[PDB]
Design a protein around this ligand. Structure first.
Ligand SMILES: C=CC(=O)Nc1cc2c(Nc3ccc(F)c(Cl)c3)ncnc2cc1OCCCN1CCOCC1
Length: 277
């Protein structure tokens, strides 16, 4: 019942200058220059009424969040096509980043990522927001020490292998069903990008989950870290941990990361979007 007094900035297409392509809708990269004497690295993500109705729903959610660990919208552009202008995350998504750098990611970085994602989801819970699509592919990286949650095409208030059981069976998505997807996300990071339930077809996922089976313990994980992941996968959603508790637990472990993760080897006027307020 709180008024979403967020702001939706409409941006002239002459304000930003595209440079290269990132993904193909198609995601682009460029610089947004607001008369402001400043350059901002951005990511600039045809007639289908539902394609616009969903794209603008994403822009609604991104514009209504503000947190160090949640990607925020800088604005939208209403030209021949609707564009979403967001903060440029130079290192891509965390899934690709954890796969390309398997042999240079240490326990401190892994546990720090778990804390930051739990902080991001804890903010979304403050905003009465259920993500419904938490995964390693949907967490972006601006620096190796700073990640944010993104991709709110599902967010409210199909990815079977990330959903809570109640979601797969009863279409029920709660803040606690995000905790389930969080545990799968941490599993992706602790396995350096392994596909969850690789092989097992999605037709049998809800059946093996009802049999009690979960994802195996990743090799680098002490039982302390894996216990937390297992707790995110209990059938009673209320027994699952809270994001505010996951922050506390993973932060305690980030104070001594080698005790809980056993890993072998432990332009001119440019401003960042996070300094443009
Ligand atoms: C199809 C792939 C793809 O889009 N990647 C990227 C997506 C980004 C993004 N997405 C987005 C999400 C939700 C939104 F609402 C909007 Cl508006 C945008 N936002 C910001 N920065 C991004 C940077 C990306 O790549 C970085 C280059 C690293 N690469 C090359 C070197 O190796 C490592 C990977």
């Amino acid at each position: 019942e709180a008024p979403n007094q967020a702001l939706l900035r409409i941006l002239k297409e002459t304000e930003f200058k595209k440079i290269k392509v990132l993904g193909s809708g198609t995601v682009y990269k460029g610089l947004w220059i607001p008369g402001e004497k400043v350059k901002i690295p951005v990511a600039i993500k045809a007639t289908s009424p539902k394609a616009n109705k969903e794209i603008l729903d994403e822009a609604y959610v991104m514009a209504s969040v503000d947190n160090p660990h949640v990607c925020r919208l800088l604005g939208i552009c209403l030209t021949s096509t609707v564009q979403l202008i967001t903060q440029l995350m130079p290192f891509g998504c965390l899934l690709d980043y954890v796969r390309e750098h398997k042999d240079n990611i240490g326990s401190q970085y892994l546990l720090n990522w778990c804390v930051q994602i739990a902080k991001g989801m804890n903010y979304l819970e403050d905003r009465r927001l259920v993500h419904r699509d938490l995964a390693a592919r949907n967490v972006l990286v601006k620096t190796p020490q700073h990640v944010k949650i993104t991709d709110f095409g599902l967010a409210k208030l199909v990815p079977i292998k990330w959903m809570a059981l109640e979601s797969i069976l009863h279409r029920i998505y709660t803040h606690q069903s995000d905790v389930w997807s969080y545990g799968v996300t941490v599993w992706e990071l602790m396995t350096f990008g392994s596909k969850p339930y690789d092989g097992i077809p999605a037709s049998e996922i809800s059946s093996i989950l009802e049999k009690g089976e979960r994802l195996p313990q990743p090799p680098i994980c002490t039982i302390d870290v894996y216990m937390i992941m297992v707790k995110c996968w209990m059938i009673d959603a209320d027994s699952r941990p809270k994001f505010r508790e996951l922050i506390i637990e993973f932060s305690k472990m980030a104070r001594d990361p080698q005790r809980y993760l056993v890993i072998q080897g432990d332009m001119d006027d440019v401003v960042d979007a996070d300094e443009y307020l």
